[PDB]
Each structure stands twice: as C-alpha cells, then as structure tokens.
Amino acid sequence: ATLKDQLIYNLLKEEQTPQNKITVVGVGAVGMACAISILMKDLADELALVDVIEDKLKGEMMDLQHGSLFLRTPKIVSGKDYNVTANSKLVIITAGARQQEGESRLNLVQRNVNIFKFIIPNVVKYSPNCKLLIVSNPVDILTYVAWKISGFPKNRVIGSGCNLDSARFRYLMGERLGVHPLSCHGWVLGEHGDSSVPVWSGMNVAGVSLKTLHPDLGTDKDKEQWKEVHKQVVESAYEVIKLKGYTSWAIGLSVADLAESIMKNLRRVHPVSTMIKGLYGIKDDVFLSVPCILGQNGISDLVKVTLTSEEEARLKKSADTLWGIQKELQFH
Amino acid sequence: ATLKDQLIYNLLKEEQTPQNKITVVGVGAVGMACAISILMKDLADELALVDVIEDKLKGEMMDLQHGSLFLRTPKIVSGKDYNVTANSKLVIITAGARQQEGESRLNLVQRNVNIFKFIIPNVVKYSPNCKLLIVSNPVDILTYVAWKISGFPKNRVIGSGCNLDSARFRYLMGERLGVHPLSCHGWVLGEHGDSSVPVWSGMNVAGVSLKTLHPDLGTDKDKEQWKEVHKQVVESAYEVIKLKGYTSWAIGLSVADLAESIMKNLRRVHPVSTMIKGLYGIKDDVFLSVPCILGQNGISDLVKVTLTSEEEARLKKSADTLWGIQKELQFH
Amino acid sequence: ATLKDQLIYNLLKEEQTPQNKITVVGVGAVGMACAISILMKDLADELALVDVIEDKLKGEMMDLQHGSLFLRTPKIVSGKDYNVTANSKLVIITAGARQQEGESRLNLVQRNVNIFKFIIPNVVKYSPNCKLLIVSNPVDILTYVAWKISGFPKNRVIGSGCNLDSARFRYLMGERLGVHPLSCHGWVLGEHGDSSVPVWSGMNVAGVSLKTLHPDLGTDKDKEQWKEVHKQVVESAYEVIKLKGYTSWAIGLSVADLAESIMKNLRRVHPVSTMIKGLYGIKDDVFLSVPCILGQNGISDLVKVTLTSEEEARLKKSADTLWGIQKELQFH
Amino acid sequence: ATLKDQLIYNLLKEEQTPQNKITVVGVGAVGMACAISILMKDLADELALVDVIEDKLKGEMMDLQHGSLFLRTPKIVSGKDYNVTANSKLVIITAGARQQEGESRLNLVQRNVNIFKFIIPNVVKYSPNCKLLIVSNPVDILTYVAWKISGFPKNRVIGSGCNLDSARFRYLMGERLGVHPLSCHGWVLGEHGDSSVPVWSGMNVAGVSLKTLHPDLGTDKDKEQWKEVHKQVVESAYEVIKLKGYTSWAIGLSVADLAESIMKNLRRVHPVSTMIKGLYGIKDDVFLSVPCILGQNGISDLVKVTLTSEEEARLKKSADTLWGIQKELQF
C-alpha cells in the first residue's frame, strides 16, 4: 500500500480533455514572455510549449513548473512532438527563421514557409478547432502563410500585427500629455513596420479629438512634430534591440491581452492583422491591421475606419508590396 | 497655446513623491524576472531599475514601459545613479559577481563585498526606511554582508534563502501525490544549497503527517526514496542552467510572493534567510532559512521549528561553515 | 443601413456557445455575494442568475450588468426559466426556505426538498454535465437531496459543507497567533453545524504540530481553551445574524474559492461535503465534510484523515443523525 | 510557557503606520458594495468602516473578517468613533439623508449639511491629508458641502459624479453595437441626475466618430433614437430600485475603479465632480462632472471638452440651480 494510496482515496479516472488550453510555439525570448504573461493572467488551465531545440524547451518548461506554487495553471507541458499541443483553444506562433547577412526578404519568407509547412499541419492535426495567433516576423506575410497552409477560415487566423505598435503609440501619447495610456486613444493600422499608418483623426482623450484642436496634427508643418511619435513607434523595437539585444516584455504583455479577449470571449476591439481583400480597395489575399472584434471564434467582426485618401493609398501600397512577395512563394 | 494646454487644464503642481516604490538591482535574467512578476501583480506604483551596464539597463526600462497600457504601475525609471531609487519601500538585490575558474568561495564573497560597499550605502542613503531583500548568491552569506554594511536592524534585511527550494519541494511533492502545490505542505530550511534540510516531520496534506503515515520517509530504507525529491530540489538550478543556460521564471515568482507579503503587510510565513544566533545552539552572526512572518517592517517574528538532533546538527554545521567564510571578510 | 452596419463589418454568425458558464440559483444575500465574488475573480465567460421572484431577479441582473465596464465577464443573464442556464459548467444552488415560528426542523427540510424537486430537474435538463455546488441549509442533507434527485455520480455533487467553517477557524487561529490565516492550518470536518469536528492533530503553522507542542490542545483541561475557538466557529453565523440580520460576504468568498478550483481544475484540497459511505464505518448514503481534491470533474479524490476513536465516533453519530432525517424525506 | 511561546519567537516591533488605508463611511448597501469591491481589488492594507449603528457595523466588519482567508487585506476595523479611521489615504462618504414626502430640495440639503458637520470635521481630524470621495446624493451639492466644511483644497475633494452614468452609457452602447464596453467610448457630464449631458461628439469606437457617421445621433430625428440610451442612463438607478429595492453592485464597482486610480496614482481620466468655477461661463462655486485626471493628490488636471452651445447652456443652468440652493445654506 503506497503512501499516496494510504493518504488519498481515488474515486475518478481521467478524461484527457482540458478546457482552456493555450499552446505557445517557439520558446525564444518572445515566446517565453508570451508564456509568463499568460500564466500570470490566469488565462489557461493547461499550457503547452513546443520548439525544435530539446534541452532549451525542457529547461524552460521546468523553470515555469518550479513556479507552480505561485500560479493558477496546474498543467505545464512541453515536447518536440506536437501531440502535446492537443485540444488547444489558442496556439500562439513565435517561431521563425533569423535573417542572414546577404539574404533577401523573399528568401527569408520562403524559409519561414518551409518551417510553417511542418508546424502548421501538426497544429491543425492535434487541435482542429483552435485559433492561430501569429507573432513571427514578418507577421503580415506569415499570417497569410499560416492561413493558406492550415486551410482555416479567416476568422480563426489572426496576426499580432499592429497591436503593440498601437500600445507604444499610446504610451508615447501619454508621456506627452501626462495621462495614462488607458485614457489616451489612437490607432496604428496597416502593415506592421515602417509603412504603418497612424490614424490622426481617431486620436483623442475623453472624446476630445486632437485633430479638431490641432488641425496640423501629424503633418510636416506641425510645430510640435507629432509625426515623430509615430517614427518612434516604428523605430522602437530596433532601438530596444540595439540597447539590450532583443525585445520581449511589451510583446509578451501585448499577446497576453489578445489571448485574454479570445479566451474569455470579451469582444473587445484590437488592432490585429486580418485578411482584408474587399476593403480599402485591396483586391489581393493580404493581411493588414484593422480594429477587430476578438472573441472565442477569433475575429468575429471588424470596424470600418474612415480613412483619408492619403491613408487609404498607404494601405493599398502596403498590400501591393505584400502580394509582390507572397506571389513568389512556393507552397508545393 | 499648445495642444496639451488647450486640452488639459492644470490645477496643481506638487513635488511627486511615490508611495509603494520598489527598486530591483541588477537587470540580469533574475532581476528582470523579479521585475515582470512584480509588475503583473500590481505590487508597486513606481518600479526602479539600477545596474552598471547602461545600454542594457535602458533597453530593459523601455521594453517594460512600452507595455504600460497593459499594466497598472504608472511609472518605470532606471539609471546607474541611485538617485532614481529614492524613497523605495523595498529594494531587491539580484546583482553580484560571477565566480571565475580556480576562484575560491571566499574570494568570490570578497568580490561581492567590494561590490556591496558601493551598492548598499547608496541604497540606504536614498531610501533609509526600506527593506532589503537579497537574492544574489551565495544568498545566506550576502544577507549578512548587506546587513553589516547597511547598519539596518535584522528585521529589515531579508534573504530569499530557501523560499524557492520550498516551493520546488512542494511542486515535486505535488507531482507524486496528484495534488496542487498550494495544498502540499513541506519546508526546506537552513542553508540555501547542498546542505539544506528537508523537514520530513512537517510534511503534510490536509494536516495529515506523511511521516506518521509512512515512518521510513526521507530515510535510506524508504522504498519510495523521498530523499530523491530533496536531491532534485538541491540540483534544480544546476539542471536548469544545463538545459537552458540560466534560471529566471521560478525565482522571479518566488521573489514577487515575498514582495506581496511585505508591501501588503500580510504577515504570511515564508522560509527566508534571517539572523538566527540564539536558535539551535548557534552562537555566531549567521543567516539561515527559518519560517518567518513578513509584513511592512520586514521580519517581525519567526517560527521555532522542532528539529531532530540530526537535522539540528546540519543547521549547526552549516552555521559553522557560513561563519568560517564570514569571519575572513574585510569591510574596512 | 444602420449605424452598427456602417461601423462594423460582420464576418460570421454565432455565438450562443459559452465555454465557462456558471449559474447561480437564488438571489438572496448569499447568492449575490457568490455572484459578485465570482465576477471579480474572472472565473466565468457567462453568468446566469435564477430565482422565483422576477422583479428581484431582473433588478440584480441589471445592477451587475451596469458594472460591466469594470468586469471581464461579457454576458450576464437571468430569468425564471431555466433555459437561461443551458450548458453551465458549474451550478451553485443558494435557494432555500427559512424556518417559521413553531415549525419543526423536519418540516423545514421537507420544504427545502420540495423546492429542490423543482430546481434540480430543471438544472439537469439544461446542463446535464455540470458540477453541482449546494450551499443551501441544511447543506449536508440538501447535498444528499440534490444527489438523489439529479441522478449524478457523487463526484459531480459537492456541498459547501465545512469549507467556510474551516476558513473561520483559521481566521481565529490567526488572530490568536499573530499570523495570516493563509499560514495557519486547521480543518473542521464532519457535519456543518453543532456536531462538526475540529481535527486538533492536524493543526499547525509552518509544519509544526500544535498538538505536539501543546498535548492538552482542545481537551477540557486546556489552560488556553482552544475548544472555544471551535465554539466561536460554530456560532459565528448566528452572531453575525444577530448583529446585521443575515450573512453574506464570507460565504460568498468561500464559494468563489471552490468555483476557482473547479473552473480552473487546480486540484486543491478543500473541506467540502461529499458522499462517504465506506469511510469511517458508515454504511449509509450520507454527506459530510472531509478534505477533497477539487477540479473540473468535481471531487476526484479525497484525503483519508486519520481520526482518533472519539473523532470517528462523532462522524458516525452525525451520519446516524443525518440518515434518520433523510429516510423520512418524500421525493414523490 | 504557552503554545504561542513555544511556536513563535518574537522580534522587537517597530511602529506600524498604515500605508494604504481606506475608510468607507456608511454601511448601507452602497457602502458595503464599495468595501467588498475595494477588498477584492487589493487596493488597501487596512479598511475602516464607520456608521452610527453599532450592531450593524460590527456585524458587517465580522462578516468581512470571516473571509480573510480569501483576501489579501490583513486588517479590517470598524467603529462609531472616527479614531478607527486614523491615517486614511482615501475616505469614501456614502452616508446621507433620505428625502421625506413633501420636503423641499433646500431642506433636504440642509439636513445633509448638519450631518456632514459631524462627519467631515471628524474625518479630517483623524486623517488630515486624505482625499475625500463623496458618493452621497445629491452628489454634486454634497461635494460642495464636504469641500467648504473640510477646509480642503479642491484637488482633494472628489464627487463620484457622472462616473457610473458614463459606465452605464457604455454598457448600453455596447449592447447595441455588439462590442464590449471597454472598447465603447462616450462621456456623460455635468450634473449627476436628470440634467446630465451625453456628449454625442465624443462617442466613438476605435477612434471613429458615431456622430460623423450618423449625423442625426442624439436628436429627435434619429431613427435609432440614441437619446433613449441616455434617458435609460438617467432612469437606471430609479428602475433598479423598483425592481430590487435599492442599488449597490454597479456603484460599488464604480467607486472601486476611482479608488484604483487614486491609490495607485494611475492618472486615468474619469468623469467625476469637481469645482469648475472658470469653465463654461460658470462664475460660481459649484461642482460638476468633467473628465478629470485622478492620482495620488486626487484631481490634478481636467480635460477641456468642447461642448455645443446647447451642452454648455445645460451645464450653465445646472450651475445656476446648484448655486441657488448652496447660497441659502448655513454652516
């Protein structure tokens, strides 16, 4: 009669099935920041981690597990085999290839295509009703890639896109004004990167339009140079990488917030990357960021922002660029 | 007028003085893990980071700042200058020397003393009412050093000690029993390291003594080899360092839990490192792990755990070893 | 086109499928304290309230709904019809009669049986795979009642039992000792009420047995009169009723703690009422409180607490008391 | 030696001053909702309850204490004497009179003044550097009263004002749009009650103006009648009362939300009642709801909303009406 059995009378067995499982693919600094942030917000009853480097994956799992006493997520698992990700509600993809010195953007994407041809089908096999959240750079293109390979409908394939960008924009907006970012409002949309669009018309505090107060807001002739705030948004990851050698915390928190709306079915609006053939004159299968309603079925609806002609043309240019790359990919 | 002044009307300007400020020293993986956990538990209204590497320091500051929208800690600052740490309630020390090849234990502690002769007087100058929480290894020795240099009474000088060891033990106790660590009770006391004491007699679930149920517990003749659970605890950091290159997550959560009790004055019992000359026939100024009651003035009380004479001799031997090194240290 | 259609582009149909729904039956002070506590711990994506009094019911629902901005629970429903409770993971029953002047105890219980015969079948029709958590007095009898009427296996029918008793006990233990209740351990087992059993042997702080330190603990000869603490626990609800007219806050927090373990599958050990035919020589279908591992399938395991002969005889006496009442209850 | 002697070894104790203490005055349903939400949001290291009814007060304290296991607020105290409130950072006032059948507005407010003449000096005696948060109806006037009696600067005297009204508005807005209220934005301002003002201009989701998209928004000629959402806001509390007898849960969460911003110095923007002699043609000492930045020194700043002529005038009319009552009061 073992100690366990002298102590505990069993009366039930298992079923396997967990109810609120999240999987994070890739356990680099981004993936692990996604993981700790999700764990501390009690978003899941099971957390699976997956990556190709066995020792690192096991050490990260172990390290999280050793903190279980301080957490409310009772099952943390890992492995190279995707069997461990089974029945996940949300699967967050952070794994990707690192760009080499003399390598084209297109080649870097092709190498990510090849990687995703392993990852994505293994994900769908083991969790056919899950939402995909793609964080991997370049996120807009890799969301398309995940979409084509998975064969999921568009509402269940989401890219992190311009979500953190918008948060950064609001942080900075808050620093200028002396107000918490929760109470500053502003949207960065379109291509996550240099060609993202800061929507000046929507920027406000307490419903007071900044543009109405300051018509030259976000133009060259702006005495206060608010276009710099957006430049800072675009060059913020690069500036952090220079300083500490990578980014993690903001993106981790950012992703955990997206997971929160999905898992809890909150129907909050977030700027995330979605397939938007139809809108703003775009006619190719391309993912850009737009304010989306996020819930248990992924992106259920999206908000139609009125954009000026200039802004509209920025989204159109970004889509041509994205399609320019996507059309040279090889899936078969 | 500016856009800020047209928007916001200022009512008053008073010198901004923070009320629940916490500083973390060292922005290595350990330090940043402590920081992120504290931020996500909302334990402070101001978080300050300090370290000697400026690029890295600033990078970590900015990465956190950038996620402010997702947090409720309004102000994050950093600097190599300790003026940024002014009026901190709790100051957590994670910084220290990394042992060189062929270097003695003593000489490693000495280099940590030279470092603390810089750090500690700067911490006390700028917030003299704070509590010190030492995390850097060797933690029991470095709590002494922190205590001797600060001039602080012992209650305000705390070492993370066996806090995480105990949590690891509970995790592992949990995986054997099939029960969450919250409901598995057991204490690892003494010196944080190879010489720690797993207090078999106190191990329980729902108040039922595992020792009483299974008298061979933690003895060589135990057919379930519960002694290995302790071995796993002692070798956990090593095994994790080997797998993934460092440790961060569990320790960070460990330290935020202590911080919670302190900042909220909860008076929970935590196994942390404290001055115990007087107990277990110990006659020197040595810090070891005993259950302590933590609150807003640090350690207010400690629990007198009853030890077998064998367990008692292990604390004693550890005490002698710690004093052996401590008495060979130079402060002036 | 409406303003909704001009603002929002709908991508798909749904939902009507809630993943973590909790129903609360009864909107007295108890049911609503349970409701608010659950809302502030973010345990559910949907909350349903049911009661027989429509105005009270609509009012409570509204009042909660008006707070939605400060919550993370997006759907709050109520109604007299149990169709609003479809697909609930957990159903918490707080409805029940109060004793009238000159009414016998048997008659009171029978009336509670009579309302359960309306409530339980309606709960099981609409959520046949839910866990049931009975809070209504007398809780041990009515947990039997819900069990027999529902048809559910014993694992999915749970009484709140001595859960709050145990929490009150630890509160007072904490006041006496100068320690937070989180670090004081003690279990009150058996029949919720006058005949409940404070397990002296299991009481400890930091794994140190109080019984071993103080062997007269909880005897008649005890110079410190610890038995009075148990008296206070048993009479605490009565004292609060005298002072303010009813009880709510403590029970509400206590019920939300159990919900947490169920919803999040934590496998924490709680002292809750369960069917213990087979244990302690009891051969009757009776429910009383013993420590139980709680999770997504209700009670999966229980801790065999080692009781002295006296302690065991008391549980056997309660079982006999309980069964003698139950056998006189009409279910047809 | 006692049990305690053998278990616990005690160290020199230093002075415990509470660092995050919040007092709630009035243990009606409103006060108690305020308390429980504050407790479940870990905003305080000490919670004080005060009221004139000793039994009810003690029982409410006890009931919260019995839940200490599931909380992280280690000291909960109560008493009739305001010494139990010493060193509060925030003091939340919920007590106040109930208007009687046939009683004028002036007479009701006068009775509140006499009650506040007992409560306010006592509260400032024991916590002189606190922020006062006034929840008691009529809130705008009673915030004035609390201000003049306390001797406090305007930044430390706060009225819950239109905070909950706006929160209600967003919920109802969310129900129509199928969006969570966190992502619906709109402000209700001015006098808390029938005369409050829904700023249609500021209503947006994701920065897109509803007004711009639907120009007849708010007006009589609106096919969707968005004016009924504000009528619904104005009449909600009244309606909840008919149904259940009283209001508590929503207001409790509303007050905890402001406590959050105050206790943690968040500098979030909340529609609360503040003294706005200076804006909107208002030349009198009156408190109305305006979007205010809340932090550790209370109201540090406010947002200057651009109102329509109609919106401004309604604020101006409320100001006049409030001063007309306040000018007849005797302190």
On whether the CB atoms of residues D105 and D325 are closer than 8 A, the answer is yes
Alpha-carbon distances, residue C51 vs A298, C45, C94, C122 (angstroms): 34, 21, 9, 12
Question: Looking up tokens 């009864």, which residue turns up?
Answer: C26
**Three-class SS state of C178:** coil
Q: Which chains touch D (3 or more CB pairs under 8 A)?
A: A, B, C
Residues D308, C248: Cα–Cα separation, whole Å: 47
D232 CB burial (10 A radius; 0-12, 13-18, 19+): middle
Size of interface A-B (CB pairs under 8 A): 177
Q: HSE of A66 in the Cβ direction (CA atoms, 13 Å)?
A: 28
- In DSSP notation, B96-120 reads -PPPPTT--HHHHHHHHHHHHHHHH
Alpha-carbon distances, residue A286 vs A160, A164, B229 (angstroms): 14, 20, 53
Q: Residue B125 carries which side chain, given as an amino acid letter? A: K
- Would the CB atoms of B7 and A177 count as touching at under 8 Å? yes
Q: Which of B66, B185, B192, B214 is catalytic?
A: B192
- Would the CB atoms of C7 and D55 count as touching at under 8 Å? no
Q: Rounded to the nearest 5 degrees, what angle is found at the Cα of C71, between the Cα atoms of C67 and C74? A: 95
Q: Residue B96 carries which side chain, given as an amino acid letter? A: G
Over its C-alpha atoms, chain C yields an Rg (Å, rounded) of: 21
Size of interface A-C (CB pairs under 8 A): 101
A205 touches chain C (CB under 8 A): no
Q: CB count, 10 Å around CB of D224?
A: 14
C15 CB burial (10 A radius; 0-12, 13-18, 19+): middle
Taken in order A77, A83, A87, A89, is the CA torsion positive or negative? positive
Question: Looking up tokens 């080692």, which residue turns up?
Answer: C306
Q: Is the peptide bond before A138 cis (omega within 30 degrees of 0)?
A: yes
Which residues does residue A158 pair with via DSSP β-bridges, in sequence order? A133
A117 touches chain B (CB under 8 A): no
A187 touches chain D (CB under 8 A): yes
Q: For residue B269, which residues of chain D lie inside 8 Å, CB to CB?
A: none
Residues B27, B24: Cα–Cα separation, whole Å: 8
What topology is assigned to C14-161 in CATH?
Answer: Rossmann fold (3.40.50)
- Would the CB atoms of C14 and A302 count as touching at under 8 Å? no
Selection from A151, A189, A168, A200 nearest residue A272 by Cα: A189
Q: Which chains touch C (3 or more CB pairs under 8 A)?
A: A, B, D
Residues B175, B164: Cα–Cα separation, whole Å: 17
Which residues of A fall in the annotated binding site for substrate? 105, 137, 168, 247
B243 touches chain C (CB under 8 A): no
C79 touches chain D (CB under 8 A): no
Task: Encode B139-193 in three state secondary structure.
Answer: HHHHHHHHHHHHCCCHHHEEECCCHHHHHHHHHHHHHHHCCCHHHCECCEEECCC
Please, where in chain D does CATH 3.90.110.10 lie?
162-329
- Per-residue b or e along A214-239, where b marks 16 or more CB atoms closer than 10 Å to that residue's CB: beebbeeebeeebeebbeebbebbee
- Would the CB atoms of A213 and B7 count as touching at under 8 Å? yes
Q: CB count, 10 Å around CB of D41?
A: 18
Residues A331, A116: Cα–Cα separation, whole Å: 10
Residues D133, D156: Cα–Cα separation, whole Å: 8
Q: Residue C115 carries which side chain, given as an amino acid letter? A: I
Q: Closest to A199 (Cβ–Cβ): which among D207, D291, D304?
A: D207
Instruction: Locate D259 and state its tokens.
Output: 């406590």
Instruction: Locate B32 and state its tokens.
Output: 């940043």
**Three-class SS state of C172:** helix
Instruction: Locate B170 and state its tokens.
Output: 């509970």
Instruction: Locate C290 and state its tokens.
Output: 């013993």
- Would the CB atoms of A186 and D201 count as touching at under 8 Å? no
Q: For residue A261, which residues of chain D lie inside 8 Å, CB to CB?
A: 180
**If you count them, how many residues does chain A have?**
332
B128 Cβ contact partners less than 8 Å away, ≥ 6 residues apart: none
Task: Encode D264-286 in three state secondary structure.
Answer: CCCCEEEEEEEECCCCCCCCCCC
Residues of C with a catalytic annotation lie at: 192
A1 touches chain B (CB under 8 A): no
Instruction: Locate D318 and state its tokens.
Output: 């409320």
Alpha-carbon distances, residue C38 vs B200, C29, C41, C48 (angstroms): 37, 14, 5, 12
Q: Looking at residue C138, what DSSP letter applies?
A: S
Alpha helices (H) along D127-278: 139-150, 163-177, 210-213, 227-244, 249-263
C87 touches chain A (CB under 8 A): no
Selection from B181, B191, B185, B186 nearest residue B161 by Cα: B191
Over its C-alpha atoms, chain D yields an Rg (Å, rounded) of: 21
On whether the CB atoms of residues A184 and A210 are closer than 8 A, the answer is no
- Would the CB atoms of C269 and B183 count as touching at under 8 Å? yes
Question: Looking up tokens 């809780």, which residue turns up?
Answer: C139
Interface test mutation site (partner C, options D2, D3, D235, max chain C beta carbons within 10 A): D3
Over its C-alpha atoms, chain B yields an Rg (Å, rounded) of: 21
On whether the CB atoms of residues D200 and D208 are closer than 8 A, the answer is no
Residues A25, A99: Cα–Cα separation, whole Å: 19
Task: Encode chain A in three state secondary structure.
Answer: CCHHHHHEEECCCCCCCCCCEEEEECCCHHHHHHHHHHHHCCCCCEEEEECCCHHHHHHHHHHHHCCHHHCCCCEEEECCCHHHHCCCCEEEECCCCCCCCCCCHHHHHHHHHHHHHHHHHHHHHHCCCCEEEECCCCHHHHHHHHHHHHCCCHHHEEECCCHHHHHHHHHHHHHHHCCCHHHEECCEEECCCCCEEECHHHCEECCEEHHHHCCCCCCCCCCCCCHHHHHHHHCHHHHHHHHHCCCCHHHHHHHHHHHHHHHCCCCEEEEEEEECCCHHHCCCCCEEEEEEEEECCEEEEEECCCCCHHHHHHHHHHHHHHHHHHCCCCCC
Selection from A146, A77, A88, A144 nearest residue A117 by Cα: A146
Interface test mutation site (partner B, options C293, C297, C300, max chain B beta carbons within 10 A): C293
User: What CA dihedral angle connects D173, D176, D177 and D178, to 10 degrees?
Assistant: 110
D303 touches chain A (CB under 8 A): yes
Instruction: Locate A171 and state its tokens.
Output: 């942080």
- Would the CB atoms of D293 and B45 count as touching at under 8 Å? no
**Phi, psi at A228, each rounded to 5°:** -60, -40
Selection from C45, C43, C30, C125 nearest residue C85 by Cα: C125
Please, where in chain C does CATH 3.40.50.720 lie?
14-161
- Would the CB atoms of B72 and D264 count as touching at under 8 Å? yes
Instruction: Locate D326 and state its tokens.
Output: 């306040």
C170 touches chain D (CB under 8 A): yes
D221 CB burial (10 A radius; 0-12, 13-18, 19+): exposed
Q: For residue A305, which residues of chain D lie inside 8 Å, CB to CB?
A: 206-208
B302 touches chain C (CB under 8 A): no
- Would the CB atoms of A205 and D178 count as touching at under 8 Å? no
The experimental method is X-ray
D290 Cβ contact partners less than 8 Å away, ≥ 6 residues apart: D189, D271, D272, D274, D276, D279, D302, D303, D305
Residues A302, A267: Cα–Cα separation, whole Å: 10
Beta strands B287-295 and B268-275: pairing type? antiparallel
Selection from C55, C17, C37 nearest residue C92 by Cα: C37
Q: Looking at residue B246, what DSSP letter applies?
A: S
B303 touches chain D (CB under 8 A): yes
**D262 marked among binding-site residues:** no
Helices C227-244/C163-177 angle, 10° precision:
110
CATH code given to domain A162-329: 3.90.110.10
Q: Looking at residue D138, what DSSP letter applies?
A: S
Q: For residue B297, which residues of chain D lie inside 8 Å, CB to CB?
A: 13-14, 16
D56 touches chain C (CB under 8 A): yes
B18 Cβ contact partners less than 8 Å away, ≥ 6 residues apart: B45, B46, B75, B87, D265
Residues A208, B301: Cα–Cα separation, whole Å: 54
Residues B313, B323: Cα–Cα separation, whole Å: 15
Interface test mutation site (partner B, options D3, D10, D14, max chain B beta carbons within 10 A): D14
User: What CA dihedral angle connects A82, A83, A89 and A90, to 10 degrees?
Assistant: -10
Q: If contacts are CB pairs under 8 Å, which of residues 261-300 in chain C contact chain D?
A: none
Selection from C277, C291, C80 nearest residue C187 by Cα: C291
A217 touches chain B (CB under 8 A): yes
Alpha helices (H) along chain B: 3-7, 29-40, 54-65, 105-126, 139-150, 163-177, 210-213, 227-234, 236-244, 249-263, 309-326
Resolution, Å (one decimal): 2.4
Residues A164, A181: Cα–Cα separation, whole Å: 12
Taken in order C46, C51, C54, C56, is the CA torsion positive or negative? negative
**Phi, psi at D117, each rounded to 5°:** -65, -20
- Would the CB atoms of B265 and D16 count as touching at under 8 Å? yes
Q: Which helix (H) or strand (E) holds C75?
A: strand C75-78
Selection from D148, D160, D152 nearest residue D24 by Cα: D160
- In DSSP notation, C265-317 reads T--EEEEEEEE-TTSTT--S--EEEEEEEEETTEEEEEE-----HHHHHHHHH
Q: For residue D239, which residues of chain C lie inside 8 Å, CB to CB?
A: 62
What topology is assigned to D15-161 in CATH?
Answer: Rossmann fold (3.40.50)
Which residues does residue B289 pair with via DSSP β-bridges, in sequence order? B190, B273
Alpha-carbon distances, residue C154 vs B179, C151, C277, C299, C315 (angstroms): 20, 9, 11, 8, 19
Q: Looking at residue D130, what DSSP letter applies?
A: P
Q: Closest to C264 (Cβ–Cβ): which among A6, A12, A45?
A: A45
Selection from D270, D293, D268, D283 nearest residue D315 by Cα: D283
Alpha-carbon distances, residue D131 vs B72, C36, D32, D87, D155 (angstroms): 20, 27, 19, 11, 8
On whether the CB atoms of residues B231 and B218 are closer than 8 A, the answer is no
Looking at CA atoms only, how far is residue C213 from chain A in angstroms?
A: 24
Residues A303, A318: Cα–Cα separation, whole Å: 19
- Per-residue b or e along B278-306, where b marks 16 or more CB atoms closer than 10 Å to that residue's CB: ebbebeebbbbbbbbbbbbbbbbbbbbbb
A123 Cβ contact partners less than 8 Å away, ≥ 6 residues apart: A23, A25, A82, A85, A91, A130, A132, A150
Residues A34, A48: Cα–Cα separation, whole Å: 12
Q: For residue C302, which residues of chain A lie inside 8 Å, CB to CB?
A: 8-9, 11
Looking at CA atoms only, how far is residue B1 from chain D in angstroms?
A: 13
Helices C29-40/C249-263 angle, 10° precision:
50
Q: Is the peptide bond before C138 cis (omega within 30 degrees of 0)?
A: yes
By 3-state DSSP, what share of chain C in percent is helix, strand and coil, each rounded to 5?
Answer: 45, 20, 35
Instruction: Locate B140 and state its tokens.
Output: 């029991």
D13 touches chain B (CB under 8 A): yes
Residues A129, A125: Cα–Cα separation, whole Å: 10
A305 touches chain D (CB under 8 A): yes
Instruction: Locate A218 and state its tokens.
Output: 């976000």
Looking at CA atoms only, how far is residue C139 from chain B in angstroms?
A: 22
Taken in order A6, A8, A14, A18, is the CA torsion positive or negative? negative
Interface test mutation site (partner B, options D9, D41, D276, max chain B beta carbons within 10 A): D9
Q: For residue D19, which residues of chain B lie inside 8 Å, CB to CB?
A: 19-20, 89, 265, 296
User: What CA dihedral angle connects C292, C294, C297 and C298, to 10 degrees?
Assistant: 60
Q: CB count, 10 Å around CB of B100?
A: 10
Q: CB count, 10 Å around CB of D309?
A: 7
Q: CB count, 10 Å around CB of A115?
A: 18
Which residues of A fall in the annotated binding site for NAD(+)? 28-56, 98, 137
Q: Which of A66, A180, A185, A192 is catalytic?
A: A192
**Three-class SS state of C95:** coil
Residues A118, A140: Cα–Cα separation, whole Å: 19
Q: For residue A170, which residues of chain B lie inside 8 Å, CB to CB?
A: 69
Interface test mutation site (partner C, options D13, D32, D39, D69, max chain C beta carbons within 10 A): D69
Instruction: Locate C311 and state its tokens.
Output: 């302690």
Q: Is the peptide bond before A153 cis (omega within 30 degrees of 0)?
A: no
